[PDB]
Design a protein around this ligand. Structure first.
Ligand SMILES: Cc1cc2nc3c(=O)[nH]c(=O)nc-3n(C[C@H](O)[C@H](O)[C@H](O)COP(=O)(O)OP(=O)(O)OC[C@H]3O[C@@H](n4cnc5c(N)ncnc54)[C@H](O)[C@@H]3O)c2cc1C
Ligand SMILES: CCCCCCCCCCCCO[C@@H]1O[C@H](CO)[C@@H](O[C@H]2O[C@H](CO)[C@@H](O)[C@H](O)[C@H]2O)[C@H](O)[C@H]1O
Ligand SMILES: Cc1cc2nc3c(=O)[nH]c(=O)nc-3n(C[C@H](O)[C@H](O)[C@H](O)COP(=O)(O)O)c2cc1C
Ligand SMILES: Cc1cc2nc3c(=O)[nH]c(=O)nc-3n(C[C@H](O)[C@H](O)[C@H](O)CO)c2cc1C
Ligand code: FES
Ligand code: FES
Lengths: 387, 446, 198, 408, 251, 204
């Protein structure tokens, strides 16, 4: 059908004006290179989400009760039918297959539901179907817990695509992050399914606390993996053995993926440097001033980095070219504000245990202000005939 | 010594060999009518009229007093009119040697002429059209004077000629032209040049300023931004080295000098070199038997800011000093965007081509992609050496804003200064025409 | 003195009038087109609020508080008329003695100069001050912080709308609908400080 | 009850204190100045009615009006003022009329300027010379279906200070006019009586003013000749309300009293040597006749001229004797005509249909340089668009297309 | 305009408006307080279990069955005063009759406590069966106020009702859920060592336990707020001495 | 005829075109009880203020016109507030500040300045009623969606059973917050300007 050939093939056009020779880069290649960057993170996330579910299920149930539970859920009996096993010694194959059966429905639902609105708008306004949804859909499907209902994911992606992105004019015209706008819609509308201890480990009847919110209770000594009984170390939280969403669990994979797109120039290193500087400064100020009743005042920078969705946000979600600043002088300020706001929401605000998604949305509002400040300074320098 | 840090030396194949050789005999010239900004002609000649050299072809209605003259003596053959009866070109068949003769001056007396006496001779001879005023790139008004004239004297365009080769043949004419410009300026003459040596004029008004770096260093806009910033209250004239040689020869001999040394080079040329030609020649018979078979695009100027030479426009421009030929790319390719290209060029590091240092590409006319919205990954900031906000200025131009574009600095720029920004745009936007529309709106709202 | 710093930061960020209490939208959505005009109006609002709150505090403490003038009498039902009279007189003074007699703010203050009187933000600030029972210095700091927060919000909206010159909005949502949706997105983003105990 | 008296007293005291503060502040600052404006330096006339506010409310009260039209608000922009001292602020509504260039030298509209402080003006000389008059009507005879020519005589032999193509601002006091006594020649009786047009009537409660253009030329001094059209409901929608002032002027008879207010003008002829092209329709014969007679009988010009006219039928043409005599007298001036739908008894031969189409197919297509000659258009707004499109397709600049229109 | 006319116009308008405004705001001053008292009386009746669907009978039922009474926290004994018009909020606010709690003992995070409190005794004739104790503490978003009705033995709770809170509905605003409030009946507040034995446990409490109460699911911060509220108000600084006197009899 | 009272419902809607009274729309639309009470209160206050201002339109000096109008409007709002506290105490406890903020409602001042000062008393009263109806239309329409989707109720009555009470509906938490009001008003404006193209704004 024509909907496939027009995607695979290049249009085969020629230049007719101005620069008769053009650069080989294009939006399709940019979006595809970003889409491929999250593949190692997604694969390790699927593996870890299978492993956590298997471990929690084995810790809770055993024997006949375990068989009754395994025969009552379609993820478990599909994993058992496809050759996998739910025993205590399941291999990486089954640990990845269970995560796949937990993640693929969410990705398919998000893709189809968002693409419907994308096609509808780009057909009504007589455009050609753009790209960037290939990135938005995968980021949204990676930043949600494995147990999120499909009817909630559909509404989240609907809000993110329609209200936040498509109303303003489509790709390259919006001012806010679409994936994070949808996630914030879900976060504020249905907070029982995106918070608590029941949503991170995809096991039936198992309640396991957030690795980030286990710190606010008792400090570094309170970090424990109740699924297996072991304690979470920095190496575990860095490699990505902690419970969490599909996407942001692994940090080594995120660094590996984001190094390529930083090298290729798609993602700016200025925003990443600003985020790092802000986080380090604020999270060292908090340690220096100290506190007695708050246990997050003593969390250092290298523990802020590994836990939560900090790495995923900083690498893949804070570097959105459209939402970020357009000035090399304002990109540093944008990154510093993002890092400072994330650390502040983590430490001082008690209602929300994680604040990267809200910090990015807050800095998206004030990026144009930084752009205006720098451009006004440049104009005032021009008026002195020195520019 | 002024060093430019940002830019892009375009690695297109077929670089010319800087040796001047005689070109093909040219039996037809033309003087275009779509390259002069805001020029509304009043034709003084008709098809079949016989014209001498330096005899006026048409005047201006928006710029009274400026006269455009015939490069060679012959018979007019075409007055081609485009859409809405716009003047595309006036074709003259060179069939004679008669000419109009002007006054002659000793080489010593050229530094003390009156400005009005210089202006009258320049306008009568037709060399007044060599100058251009930044902003708006219009031909200078007959009675206007500026205190800064920027003799380019350097070439950094892709597949461009080396001015040191051309000037050393005409050192005396170049010196005399510099003396005339120093007597005419009333300010200073900024003779931009590379680190190599050039003939020197013994005048205090003339300054030699040395530039360096990649392509945008050899642009009159960059020279003005770095030596004499321009605005609505400060206009500066611009001129190249060959027109300076023409001015010197005019004031030394009394006859207009209509020779040229252009560089015929490109990916699809058998033997790139410098060919001695005539002003406004016919490219269709200039490039015959010099091109490999197949479909080709012949350009009158650099591939970054040239003009396609097909049909009525298939003649050399006034301000262009090189002819570039490259193949036409029309075929599609399956999964071309996903290929880890070794032969593909990009300022970004997303292709395997950039790893191989020193590679030269056989670039074609394809737009590698399709028209989309602008996602500013940071390509314009890599290739803009000026003190501006590029990705804000281009968004201002695309949105149609004019006053804010002026505030951001659109006046100092020309269509030739946004060629690299158009080149490195993932959205495949053409910014030169947007800037020209913006400047036309600014001029009208005067 | 840390109490005043806490009050200032709380009023500016934790309790931003424009995007946490949502007062003054009738002008917040209508005048926010250019940063210059938005900054001028924010300065005017800052001045009016800073002068209005302490005077109302003095009057309420002196005569309108229950049992404050004569024991057994309670005149707390003149609050609305007294507050609106003080605000209106101050706005008239600002418009007529200082703003236009001195070098004027041409096109920075137009139809919206007499609209400060009916700006809901100032009346809301006075009412909240009455509820919280501040002292004089706390009232001054509260007024200044509220004004600065309102100016910050309006200037951020103006900057966003200036960035939105490149957008392509549907004809129905041109201008006002898109302004409402943009303000809703900004309010969604401004919920980071919701649970802070400052 | 004791709280009620306290509340009443405190309400009164607080409101009185606020009002007194406002009044005292006003008394401490109000300039209370007067005569803050000088319309020019040389003339002694530097007096107005108001110390500030809007500018017409001070000048028109003292008798100065560029054109103090009804309502104001710059809906037509004839209230032209030039300023050189005072506030330089520009109303948002004034950028539409004033370009930045004119803004630097201080050009604005009058119904937008607000006066508060001292200033001096540099008003053009035409303000100092315009005046009203007492012209009596001589003839108001009909010569077409909707076209009437009005002839007036100037009292005491004065000559209006006008140029070719101008217009005087006619007045019409309160009146009530009926169409019953209207009567046209026998040929126009058919279409006139098809709806009979006499049942119509107009109500005028206060004096009203519109403008008309002179069909005469400066060597016909002592007599004002105009081309007046009747304002009737459109034939396709007769239920549309009719026109008032045009009907009133139609009702004017010979020997009747009339008052003009003064001549104004635009659309003048350029002082060049290029060819002149005059194109028009409907009631547009007035400026074209004025220009033709000026250039030929008054200016003795020898520039090549052509006057292209379009009509509907042979019965719809007048001034034919005049234009034929002028063409016979002058070789440089040739005038052509076309009919939209000629009738079998018109005995018409030659051009037919739309005037722009006949022009393009007959003259300008074979013209060598249609971009150097000057065009003057004054006619129907629907002919305006067609002629503009044709000339722009031929490639004529805006400076060579000089047109006069009455805003559709 | 002239001052002679402007002052007269302003004075006449003020004299026209002020009588209306003052008469409206003074005539209704009785109803404006009856309506306020009705809400508290209805809440107390609901906590005590007496059914009164109407402001007509709420007044008589509260006047006959419920006897408000003041209690001194420091002495744990009754005080004589206008209990029916007491204002605990302003009493705690004023520094004249309040104690500034210190950090180590301000478990409920209320930062101030009144010197004398108010309790309500439910009785018929002159025999008392219950006593309603108003307790409050800090939650997550706002202050949470409640009435807890304990039996005359000083141990057994016969109902808990939250009448003022501002938590998130559906997540932490489940303190007003009848399914959650109805499980407090029969629970015991003290152990044999006179320690506060009420424990809001997470994830569910053993069925039939005399000291455990089911926590709010997904609302651990609000559950901790409730736990702090009870650990403070049942402690030494709250109704501790008063309940010590109560369990000995003579309530 | 009823053009004055019927047109400002859609033709000249205050919130949709004039951008007047939006703060109360964002605030009090969470529940239909408060929305309807606010609609009635603003209707009565606007109508009576317009009536009195038109009655005394001749004898208002320019210098203290704002004070003269605010005296009347604040007196009306004080009377309304006392009546609400006396008879509708449960509702009045919920509106709180946005009952005293009726004075600073921009609709009241806009209709007092634009129409009341220069129109006859009865036309002013009719125009006030019409503007109040046009405002209440938006108030109740937004409140319908907000209440129904955020609490599964209408006027305090049960319509959609809640999951916490043994039903099937899981309430949306955004409807009880402010951004939902912004989104609903934006989409209302979109639909109104789609059905009535004459109100569409220009690109320039
Ligand atoms: C500088 C200048 C010179 C001019 N010179 C001439 C000249 O020489 N000769 C000439 O004939 N004209 C001339 N005009 C045209 C001018 O407009 C004349 O006055 C013309 O006769 C129109 O009459 P009026 O101004 O009385 O129209 P008005 O009575 O002001 O308007 C009535 C017209 O509007 C219509 N109308 C009224 N109410 C409505 C309604 N509710 N709905 C729809 N339609 C309605 C009527 O049917 C009628 O067409 C000139 C105009 C200008 C600006
Ligand atoms: C790519 C790397 C770029 C960043 C380079 C390094 C930046 C770090 C700067 C500060 C160095 C120390 O940073 C941090 O200091 C604080 C003390 O100040 C230490 O803090 C430690 O001791 C304090 C003592 O009061 C405890 O309360 C705290 O819980 C504990 O972590 C952290 O363990 C250390 O990580
Ligand atoms: C938007 C939002 C609002 C919340 N509101 C409350 C609340 O009002 N009360 C509460 O106890 N928890 C609330 N929570 C949840 C807490 O933040 C915290 O995650 C939870 O109380 C801990 O659950 P657990 O320790 O029982 O696993 C809210 C969470 C979100 C995302
Ligand atoms: C480095 C990079 C990061 C991106 N991040 C996001 C993101 O977080 N969310 C999203 O919806 N799109 C993202 N996109 C896609 C696209 O840029 C985005 O939709 C724009 O905001 C256009 O609406 C990203 C693209 C790139 C190149
Ligand atoms: S009426 Fe035209 S400017 Fe005043
Ligand atoms: S209507 Fe303007 S502040 Fe509320």
């Amino acid at each position: 059908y024509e909907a496939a050939a027009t995607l695979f093939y290049t249009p085969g056009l020629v230049t007719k004006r101005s620069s008769h020779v053009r650069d080989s880069v294009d939006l399709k290649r940019i979006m595809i290179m970003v889409w491929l960057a999250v593949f190692p993170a997604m694969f390790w996330g699927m593996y870890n989400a299978g492993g956590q579910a298997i471990a929690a299920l084995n810790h809770l149930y055993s024997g006949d009760q375990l068989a009754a539970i395994v025969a009552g859920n379609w993820h478990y009996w599909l994993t058992e039918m496809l050759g996998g096993t739910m025993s205590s010694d399941a291999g990486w194959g089954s640990k990845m297959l269970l995560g796949a059966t937990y993640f693929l429905p969410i990705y398919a639902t998000v893709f189809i539901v968002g693409g419907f609105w994308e096609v509808l708008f780009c057909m009504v306004r007589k455009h050609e179907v753009n790209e960037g949804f290939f990135v938005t859909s995968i980021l949204f499907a990676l930043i949600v817990p494995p147990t999120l209902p499909l009817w909630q994911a559909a509404l989240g992606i609907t809000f993110g695509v329609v209200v936040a992105k498509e109303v303003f004019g489509g790709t390259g015209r919006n001012f806010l992050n679409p994936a994070l706008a949808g996630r914030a819609f879900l976060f504020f509308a249905y907070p029982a399914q995106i918070s608590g201890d029941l949503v991170w480990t995809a096991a039936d009847g198992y309640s396991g606390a957030y690795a980030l919110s286990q710190w606010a209770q008792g400090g570094a000594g309170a970090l424990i993996n109740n699924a297996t009984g072991q304690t979470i170390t920095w190496m575990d939280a860095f490699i990505g053995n902690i419970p969490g969403s599909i996407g942001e669990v692994s940090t080594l994979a995120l660094m590996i993926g984001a190094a390529f797109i930083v090298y290729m120039g798609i993602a700016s290193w200025r925003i990443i440097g600003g985020v790092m500087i802000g986080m380090i400064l604020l999270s060292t100020l908090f340690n220096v001033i100290g506190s007695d009743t708050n246990a997050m005042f003593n969390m250092p920078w290298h523990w802020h980095l590994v836990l939560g969705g900090f790495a995923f946000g900083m690498f893949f979600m804070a570097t959105d070219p459209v939402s970020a600043s357009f000035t090399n002088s304002g990109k540093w300020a944008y990154g510093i504000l993002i890092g400072v706001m994330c650390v502040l929401i983590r430490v001082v605000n008690p209602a929300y245990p994680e604040g990267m998604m809200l910090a990015i949305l807050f800095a998206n509002l004030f990026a144009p202000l930084f752009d205006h400040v720098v451009v006004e300074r440049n104009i005032k320098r021009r008026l002195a005939r020195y520019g | 010594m002024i060093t430019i840090k940002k830019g892009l030396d375009l690695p297109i194949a077929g670089t010319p060999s800087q040796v001047i050789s005689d070109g093909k005999a040219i039996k037809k010239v033309a003087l275009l009518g779509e390259e002069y900004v805001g020029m509304r002609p009043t034709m003084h000649v008709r098809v079949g009229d016989e014209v001498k050299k330096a005899q006026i072809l048409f005047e201006d209605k928006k710029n009274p007093g400026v006269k455009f003259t015939s490069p060679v003596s012959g018979k007019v053959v075409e007055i081609n009119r485009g859409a809405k009866r716009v003047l595309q070109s006036v074709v003259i068949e060179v069939a004679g040697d008669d000419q109009v003769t002007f006054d002659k001056f000793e080489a010593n007396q050229l530094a003390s002429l009156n400005r009005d006496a210089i202006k009258t001779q320049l306008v009568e001879s037709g060399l007044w059209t060599a100058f251009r005023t930044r902003p708006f790139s219009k031909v200078p008004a007959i009675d206007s004077t500026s205190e800064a004239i920027f003799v380019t004297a350097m070439d950094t365009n892709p597949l461009a000629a080396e001015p040191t080769v051309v000037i050393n043949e005409q050192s005396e004419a170049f010196v005399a032209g510099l003396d005339v410009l120093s007597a005419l300026t009333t300010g200073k003459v900024y003779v931009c040049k590379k680190g190599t040596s050039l003939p020197r004029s013994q005048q205090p008004n003339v300054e030699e300023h040395v530039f360096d770096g990649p392509h945008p260093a050899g642009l009159a806009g960059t020279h003005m931004h770095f030596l004499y910033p321009v605005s609505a209250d400060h206009v500066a004239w611009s001129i190249n080295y060959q027109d300076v040689i023409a001015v010197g020869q005019l004031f030394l001999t009394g006859e207009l000098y209509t020779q040229r040394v252009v560089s015929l080079a490109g990916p699809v040329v058998n033997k790139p070199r410098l060919v001695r030609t005539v002003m406004g020649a016919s490219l269709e018979q200039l490039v015959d038997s010099e091109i490999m078979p197949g479909e080709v695009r012949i350009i009158s100027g650099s591939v970054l800011s040239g003009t396609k030479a097909t049909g009525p426009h298939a003649y050399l421009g006034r301000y262009h000093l090189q002819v570039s030929v490259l193949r036409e790319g029309r075929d599609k390719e399956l999964f071309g965007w996903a290929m880890p290209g070794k032969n593909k060029f990009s300022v970004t590091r997303s292709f395997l081509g950039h790893l191989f240092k020193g590679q030269v590409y056989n670039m074609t006319t394809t737009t590698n992609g399709s028209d989309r919205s602008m996602v500013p990954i940071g390509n314009y900031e890599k290739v803009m050496p000026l003190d501006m906000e590029p990705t804000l200025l281009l968004r201002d131009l695309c949105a149609g804003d004019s006053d804010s574009a002026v505030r951001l600095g659109a006046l100092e720029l020309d269509e030739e200064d946004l060629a690299l920004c158009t080149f490195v745009c993932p959205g495949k936007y053409e910014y030169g025409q947007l800037l020209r529309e913006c400047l036309d709106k600014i001029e009208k709202e005067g | 003195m840390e109490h005043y710093i806490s009050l200032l930061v709380k009023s500016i960020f934790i309790e931003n009038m424009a995007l946490s209490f949502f007062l003054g939208m009738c002008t917040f959505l209508a005048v926010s087109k250019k940063v210059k005009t938005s900054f001028g109006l924010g300065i005017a609002v800052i001045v009016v609020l800073t002068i209005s709150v302490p005077v109302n505090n003095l009057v309420y403490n002196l005569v309108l508080k229950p049992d404050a003038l004569v024991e057994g009498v309670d005149l707390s039902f003149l609050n609305f008329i007294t507050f609106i009279g003080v605000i209106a007189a101050l706005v008239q003074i600002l418009e007529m003695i200082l703003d236009r007699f001195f070098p004027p703010l041409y096109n920075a203050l137009g139809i919206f100069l007499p609209l400060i009187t009916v700006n809901c933000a100032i009346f809301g600030g006075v009412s909240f001050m009455v509820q919280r029972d501040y002292s004089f210095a706390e009232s001054v700091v509260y007024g200044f912080g509220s004004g600065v927060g309102w100016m910050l919000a309006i200037v951020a909206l103006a900057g966003i709308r200036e960035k939105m010159k490149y957008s392509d909005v549907p004809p129905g949502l041109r201008g006002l609908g898109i302004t409402f949706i943009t303000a809703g997105l900004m309010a969604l983003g401004f919920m980071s400080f919701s649970g802070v105990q400052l | 009850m004791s709280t009620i008296i306290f509340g009443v007293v405190m309400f009164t005291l607080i409101i009185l204190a606020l009002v007194l503060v406002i009044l005292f502040a006003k008394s401490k600052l109000v300039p209370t100045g007067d005569i803050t404006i000088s319309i020019n330096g040389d003339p002694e006339k530097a007096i107005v009615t108001q110390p500030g506010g809007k500018l017409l409310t001070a000048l028109a009260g003292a008798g100065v009006f560029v054109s103090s039209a009804c309502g104001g608000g710059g809906s037509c922009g004839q209230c032209r003022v030039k300023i050189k001292s005072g506030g330089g602020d520009i109303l948002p509504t004034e950028l539409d009329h004033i370009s930045k260039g004119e803004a630097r030298e201080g050009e604005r509209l009058a119904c937008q300027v607000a006066v508060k402080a001292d200033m001096d003006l540099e008003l053009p000389e035409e303000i100092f010379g315009v005046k009203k008059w007492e012209c009596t009507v001589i003839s108001n005879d009909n010569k077409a279906t909707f076209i009437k020519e009005l002839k007036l005589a100037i009292p005491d032999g004065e000559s209006v200070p006008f140029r070719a193509g101008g217009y005087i601002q006619i007045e019409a006091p309160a009146h009530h006019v009926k169409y019953a006594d209207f009567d046209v020649p026998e040929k126009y009786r058919g279409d006139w009586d098809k709806f009979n047009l006499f049942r119509y009537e107009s109500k005028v409660d206060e004096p009203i003013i519109r403008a008309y253009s002179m069909a005469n030329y400066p060597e016909e001094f002592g007599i004002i000749m105009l081309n007046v059209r009747i304002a009737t409901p459109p034939p396709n929608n007769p239920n549309v309300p009719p026109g008032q002032m045009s009907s009133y002027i139609w009702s004017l008879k010979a020997g009747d009293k009339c008052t003009i207010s003064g001549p104004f003008g635009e659309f003048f002829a350029k002082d060049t040597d290029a060819e002149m092209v005059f194109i028009g329709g409907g009631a547009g014969m007035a400026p074209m006749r004025s220009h033709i007679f000026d250039q030929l009988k008054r200016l003795k010009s020898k520039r090549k001229m052509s006057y292209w006219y379009g009509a509907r039928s042979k019965r719809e043409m007048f001034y034919v004797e005049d234009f034929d005599g002028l063409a016979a007298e002058n070789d440089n001036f040739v005038w052509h005509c076309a009919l939209s739908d000629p009738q079998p008894e018109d005995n018409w031969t030659g051009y037919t249909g739309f005037i722009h189409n006949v022009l393009y197919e007959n003259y300008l297509k074979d013209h060598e340089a249609p971009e150097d000659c000057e065009y003057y258009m004054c006619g129907p707004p629907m002919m305006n668009a067609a002629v503009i499109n044709m000339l722009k397709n031929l490639g004529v600049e805006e400076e060579n297309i000089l047109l006069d229109d009455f805003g559709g | 305009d002239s001052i002679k006319k402007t002052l007269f116009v302003v004075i006449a308008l003020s004299l026209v408006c002020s009588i209306i405004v003052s008469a409206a705001a003074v005539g209704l001053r009785d109803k404006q307080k009856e309506n306020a008292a009705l809400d508290k009386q209805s809440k107390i009746l609901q906590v005590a279990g007496i059914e009164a669907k109407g402001s007509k009978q709420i007044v008589e039922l509260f006047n006959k069955s419920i006897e408000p009474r003041l209690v001194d926290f420091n002495t744990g004994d009754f005080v004589e005063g206008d209990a029916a018009n007491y204002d605990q909020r302003k009493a705690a606010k004023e520094a004249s009759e309040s104690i500034k709690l210190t950090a180590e003992q301000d478990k409920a995070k209320i930062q101030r406590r009144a010197n004398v409190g108010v309790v309500y005794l439910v009785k018929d004739g002159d025999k008392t069966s219950k006593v309603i104790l108003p307790v409050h503490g800090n939650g997550l978003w706002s202050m949470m106020y409640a009435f807890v009705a304990v039996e005359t033995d000083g141990n057994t709770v016969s109902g808990l009702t939250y009448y003022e809170q501002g938590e998130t509905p559906g997540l932490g605003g489940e303190v007003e859920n009848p399914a959650w409030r109805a499980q407090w009946v029969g629970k015991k507040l003290f152990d044999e060592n006179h320690k506060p034995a009420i424990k809001i446990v997470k994830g569910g409490a053993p069925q039939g336990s005399e000291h455990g109460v089911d926590g709010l699911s997904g609302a651990t911060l609000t559950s901790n707020g409730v736990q702090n509220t009870f650990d403070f108000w049942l402690g030494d600084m709250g109704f501790g001495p008063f309940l010590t006197k109560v369990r000995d009899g003579g309530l | 005829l009823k053009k004055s009272v019927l047109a400002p419902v859609l033709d000249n809607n205050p919130i949709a075109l004039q951008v007047l009274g939006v703060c109360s729309a964002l605030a009090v639309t969470t529940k239909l009880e408060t929305a309807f009470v606010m609609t009635l209160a603003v209707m009565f206050v606007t109508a009576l203020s317009n009536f009195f201002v038109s009655l005394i339109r001749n004898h208002i000096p320019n210098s203290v016109r704002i004070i003269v109008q605010m005296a009347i409007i604040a007196s009306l709002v004080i009377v309304v507030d006392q009546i609400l506290k006396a008879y509708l105490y449960d509702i009045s406890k919920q509106l709180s500040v946005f009952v005293g903020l009726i004075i600073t409602n921009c609709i009241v001042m806009g209709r007092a300045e634009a129409f009341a000062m220069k129109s006859e008393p009865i036309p002013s009263f009719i125009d006030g009623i019409g503007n109040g109806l046009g405002y209440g239309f938006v108030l109740m329409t937004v409140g319908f969606f907000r209440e129904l989707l955020g609490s599964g109720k209408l006027f305090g009555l049960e319509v959609l059973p809640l999951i916490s009470n043994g039903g099937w509906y899981q309430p949306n938490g955004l409807m009880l917050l402010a951004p939902s009001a912004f989104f609903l008003i934006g989409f209302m404006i979109w639909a109104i300007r789609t059905f009535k193209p004459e109100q569409v704004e220009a690109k320039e």
